[PDB]
Every structure is written in structure tokens, then in C-alpha cells.
């Protein structure tokens, strides 16, 4: 017995990774056919708030570290494969390896031709 | 809906002033500019040296971001495309991303009046 | 909804350390910082040389991005505004952008627990 009770299909993959994993990540994405990408130099910290460096028996926090931002605007159906590639290639087994954010994209336009939408990705 | 959007455009470094000035002339002034590298669908360019070839797969580009009233987006797309284009692969790409809220730091004004 | 958002704020370079420390003290630590240039609605500043005026239409700024749990957005807006403001045009702007998914690279943990 039971008691009665009361799209664009486009996305932006924004990932922060270590500088020394950029070429590995880029090459795996390229090999898989996910080519269009924008890369930025950034600084960051994750939930641990940076690292501690020692000098003359004293600890000093370094609360921003060099990182690389990659952005790929993609067809929605490609997001999970790209997440997988980024994670597999960026990981090293150490805190600081990176984070991926998925952000909606409502429109894409290629400048040269004014093509719009998924065909412009 | 918020009726605000973010226009994120990647253009050639030599078209930054042209595009910025054209936007300004049309009254679309608030903007954030970043130096980036990138490649589009062709995966870069091929450079020749000493009988060899090398693919340069990230090239200098400029990112402009304008957070704008939604009803201005198409006009801004048109200005960016007209002024960034050169007829050559690599001219750029424009992305439109939703923005839910905007706050001006100095006065704490929020929404479309803070654009 | 995902109940996750991106706080993207542009602030003065000389207010970064103050803002970052206040965010840290409130427990909002994960953050990405970029060097950018920008102008707001006034279109830059005027610099004088030999009694002539010249427009400087992009100035150095700092971008901070925090991807956060939605329930923290208003407090973070408050912190950024209170710490970044100086009473002068140019103090900054905050944008809130939806985030549909977050993944921690090292472990592949996803969602709000990965923030
Ligand atoms: N919530 C967040 N918002 C914005 N940027 C972030 C966030 N979390 C991480 N980042 C960026 O990603 C980079 C790498 O983060 P990191 O790998 O340290 O994340 P984490 O959550 O601390 O995981 P881990 O325990 O593996 O270190 C940071 O230096 C920062 O640039
Ligand atoms: N899908 C994408 N995601 C992220 N960034 C992109 C994407 N496509 C292009 N970009 C960025 O825009 C810049 C210019 O792209 P580009 O003009 O080469 O695009 P394209 O699709 O290859 O078109 P074209 O055939 O005109 O060259 C790239 O170098 C990169 O920074
Ligand atoms: N609509 C916008 N889109 C993108 N970036 C913006 C926008 N408005 C401001 N910015 C960025 O924020 C920075 C600071 O803007 P600013 O504080 O001058 O805003 P404002 O609207 O002109 O307010 P104020 O009257 O207090 O000066 C700019 O230099 C630019 O990097
Ligand atoms: O970024 C690193 O390499 C270590 C620091 C870290 O994991 C963090 O600040 O969250
Ligand atoms: O960016 C360029 O100038 C040429 C290369 C290009 O169009 C691309 O990589 O897609
Ligand atoms: O950014 C500054 O410090 C002053 C200029 C300004 O407020 C603007 O261009 O909107
Ligand atoms: Cl974004
Ligand atoms: Mg960490
Ligand atoms: Mg191209
Ligand atoms: Mg201003």
C-alpha cells in the first residue's frame, strides 16, 4: 500500500591546470579532435590556500601560484569526453592539479565569415 | 531573465584598437581586455626553417569582454565582426554567455544600471 | 539549478591583497587571478602633456574569479564591494555567471563538493 503524498547545446569548458601539463593536455585534446581553444596565464589557489615556504626556521604562505587557464567552447555532447581528457592528462596525484568549470554559451560567431551557432565552433 | 549578457570575443592583436575604438564610437564603452594565446579549427600555422617545418599551435590573440544589456548584443556582434575581420583564417570568434547580476563596486548599484 | 555560480570581479591592483585577505578570512579561498586592462563607463582617463590632453582608454586592473556555492554569492559581493571601494570612479565591477558543473582534476569529484 502507498500513502498519498503532496537550448543552444553549446558550452564553455574552462579548466585551470598546471603550467607543466599544458602541452600534454593540449596534445591529447588535439589528437581527439577538440582543437578550438584559448589559453591564458593566471595565478590561483584552491581550497588549501596555497603552499608554505620555509626560510631561517620560519614558515611563509605563498597564496597565489602560477597556473594555466584553457577555454574550449564546444558542442554540448562533447563536454564529458573533454572533461575526461583534461582530468586524465592534467592529473599528477598532487593537490593543485586543477579544476574544470562548465559554463553555458548561448551563441558563437566566427568573425571571418559571420557563421553562427554550432557550425562556428 | 536578467537581460544582461557577456560578449567574450577573441580577435587579432593588431585589431584591438580598431575594434575597441569602433565600439566606443557606438557607445559600448565598458570592457575588459586580456592577452591570450589560441588556435581555431586549423590548429595553428606551419613555419619553415632550414628545410624543416614546425606547427605553431598557439598564437597571440586578444580577448575582449563586454558585459552588456541583452538588446545590444547583436549590434555589438556586428561591430566586432565588421572591424575584426580581414578575410583570413584566424580573424576571431565571439561567444555570448549569460550574466545574472552586475554590481558597480563604488556605489553598489546593481543590474542594468550598473552596465 | 546547479546552485553554483562564478563571481567574476574587476578591481584595482592596489586593492587585491585587501580583497583576497577578506575573502580568505570568510572562508572563500578557491580563486583564480588574472592581470587585465579595462575601462568603465567613463572611457578611461585624461593625461596632460605640455598643456595638451591625451586620453588613456585602458588601465591596469585585476580580475578575480571565484566559483562558489550559490548561497555564498551575496556575501561575496558584499565582501568584494566593501574591500575594493575607495570612493573613486574605477573601483570595479562584479559579474555573476552561471556554472553548470565543477570537476576537481586530481580526484574527479564533481559538483558542489568540488568547489
Ligand atoms: N572554486 C574555485 N574558483 C576559482 N578558481 C579555482 C577554484 N578552485 C580552484 N581554482 C583554480 O584552480 C587551481 C587549482 O586548484 P586545486 O587543484 O588546488 O583545487 P583544490 O580544490 O584545492 O583540489 P586539490 O585538493 O586537488 O588541490 C587554483 O590554483 C585556482 O586557480
Ligand atoms: N571553439 C573555440 N573555443 C575557444 N576558443 C576558440 C574557439 N575557436 C576559436 N577560438 C579562439 O579564437 C581565436 C581565433 O580563432 P579562428 O579565427 O582561427 O577561428 P576558426 O574557427 O578556426 O575560423 P577561421 O576559419 O576563420 O580561422 C583562436 O586562436 C582561439 O583563441
Ligand atoms: N560593462 C563592463 N563590461 C566589462 N568590463 C567592465 C564593464 N564595466 C567595467 N568593466 C571593467 O571594470 C573596470 C572598472 O570599472 P569602473 O569601476 O570604472 O566601472 P564604472 O561603471 O565606470 O563605475 P564608476 O562610475 O565607479 O567608475 C573597468 O576598467 C573594466 O575592466
Ligand atoms: O597549487 C598547488 O600546486 C598547491 C596548492 C593547492 O593545492 C591549493 O592552494 O589549493
Ligand atoms: O590564428 C591565425 O592567425 C591562423 C591560425 C588559425 O586560423 C587557426 O589555428 O584556426
Ligand atoms: O579606472 C579608473 O581608475 C578611472 C577610469 C574609469 O572609471 C573608467 O574608465 O570608467
Ligand atoms: Cl565566463
Ligand atoms: Mg588545492
Ligand atoms: Mg582558424
Ligand atoms: Mg568608471
Numbering used by the authors:
A (entry chain A): -15 to -10, -2 to 112
B (entry chain C), C (entry chain B): -2 to 112
Paper text:
PII-family proteins are key players in the regulation of nitrogen metabolism in bacteria, archaea and in the plastids of plant/algae. All PII proteins known so far show a typical homotrimeric organization. The monomeric unit, of circa 11–18 kDa, consists of two α-helices, four β-strands (organized in a double ferredoxin-like fold β1α1β2β3α2β4) and three protruding loops called B, C and T. In the trimeric state, clefts are formed at the dimeric interface through the interaction of the B-loop and the base of the T-loop of one subunit with the C-loop of the adjacent one. These clefts constitute the binding site for ADP/ATP, magnesium (Mg) and 2OG.
